[PDB]
Amino acid sequence: TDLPRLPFDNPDIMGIAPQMLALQKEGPIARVGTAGEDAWLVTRYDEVRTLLADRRLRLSNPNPQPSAKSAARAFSVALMAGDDHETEPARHAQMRSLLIPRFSTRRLRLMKTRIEHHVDELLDQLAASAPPVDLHRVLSFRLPTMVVCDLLGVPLADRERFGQWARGTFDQSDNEHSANTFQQVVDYMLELVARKRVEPGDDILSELIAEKDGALSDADIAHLGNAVLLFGYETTIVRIDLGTLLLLRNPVQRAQLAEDPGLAPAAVEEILRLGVGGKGSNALIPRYAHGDITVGETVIRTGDAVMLAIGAANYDDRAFPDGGLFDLTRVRPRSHLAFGHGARHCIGRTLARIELTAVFERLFRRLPDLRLAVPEESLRWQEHRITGGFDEIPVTF
Ligand code: HEM
Ligand SMILES: CC1(C)C[C@H]2C=C(C(=O)O)[C@@H]3COC(=O)[C@]4(CO4)[C@]23C1
């Protein structure tokens, strides 16, 4: 008897930690220690999907004496209107009601066109440079920050100002740096709101300013803008890096995709499903039970913390035959859980798929000899950041 402790070691740079796959094999739910509170760890696809749809399991903490949290985690919960369990139902319903129409079919069709041209231009610059090149800096980072600049209606050069702010805000290792970075986000967004009140354009803050005859306050509008800025590029950057690493690991699938770019949608779904980095702490969706819930033979009690392992669930052989294998030819694959599920299902997931599809439609056709210029083991996943990620990806081509 040895209580398992998160985070689990992973000897590889990607995939699921062996200890978590071991727990998965034993059963759907296990009590584990963490750096803070003990929690229930749920690792099988069916149970994770069921619990993500269970409205008794919520982001907000119901407990009278809540355990202490890093500044980074406190910011992420507040951005999601999860910081007050008594007001979360109304505030989170309004949050989703105000953001979902900012990603209409009209907007997404226009953005798809611009995204496709931008990837062509980014890859032309890459192809014309001398290796070794940092693919993370010149491709993975540039496309999703371009998109956020477009959503917010600001010049592209603004991303050189805000491009590290998601990482800084979400640095769980340094509360002072996290708080000081978030204040920069706030000041920037409040400036932007003031500008859009007199100079609106076809962008998100302009739309919120006009919403319900201007009933929203500037603080409310800026809060929603902060969520778009801080959730809207960093995780996409990380999926471009992981997608590239996975395709480089699987030359037969890479060659299938280079030959037929019509396989890119299917490849993007496999990338999201298999794309887990390092110890994979960002592939856990955290919750608290607001009422008792039975999982298998286990009672989760009101107030218990629960870690929903969407990463492990996406590797579950029960839901994906040969769950550890990258396979472009899967017939009717189950919907993976990389965007979550249920009440907090990722609001940007259709836009994120458009970005990833546009990249992997083109990447290995435009750079057929692309490959890492360093050993994989030299690539360092950044465990202290809520969003993880690699800091550089050196390639040759
Ligand atoms: C591949 C890229 C992305 C991944 C893997 C991802 C993943 C996720 C996940 C797992 C959640 C659920 C969190 C939870 O249940 O507690 C979520 C929520 C969210 N995502 Fe995404 N995301 C991505 C891109 C984006 C983009 C591009 C945007 C906007 C531009 C965005 C906006 C949001 C927002 C606002 C929420 C909060 C939804 C809510 O609390 O109701 N995300 N995302
Ligand atoms: C709002 C989020 C940025 C979306 C989710 C995806 C993430 C990721 O891919 O890194 C974040 C990791 O930390 C979490 O708690 C998550 C899993 O819910 C995320 C919060």
From Swiss-Prot:
Reactions performed catalytically: pentalenolactone F + 2 reduced [2Fe-2S]-[ferredoxin] + O2 + 2 H(+) = pentalenolactone + 2 oxidized [2Fe-2S]-[ferredoxin] + 2 H2O
Residues annotated as binding heme: 346
Pathway assigned to this chain's UniProt record: Antibiotic biosynthesis; pentalenolactone biosynthesis
Biological process, per Gene Ontology: antibiotic biosynthetic process; pentalenolactone biosynthetic process
Reported cofactor(s): heme
Keywords (A to Z) from UniProt: Antibiotic biosynthesis, Heme, Iron, Metal-binding, Monooxygenase, Oxidoreductase
Superkingdom in the source lineage: Bacteria
Gene deletion effect: Accumulation of the precursor pentalenolactone F and lack of production of pentalenolactone.
CDD domains in UniProt: Cyp158A-like
GO terms for MF: heme binding; iron ion binding; monooxygenase activity; oxidoreductase activity, acting on paired donors, with incorporation or reduction of molecular oxygen; oxidoreductase activity, acting on the CH-CH group of donors, iron-sulfur protein as acceptor
EC number of the protein: 1.14.19.8
Pfam families xref list: p450 (PF00067)
Family: Belongs to the cytochrome P450 family.
Function: Catalyzes the final step in the biosynthesis of the sesquiterpenoid antibiotic pentalenolactone by mediating the oxidative rearrangement of pentalenolactone F to pentalenolactone.
NCBIfam families named in the record: PentlenlactSyn
Protein's name according to its UniProt entry: Pentalenolactone synthase
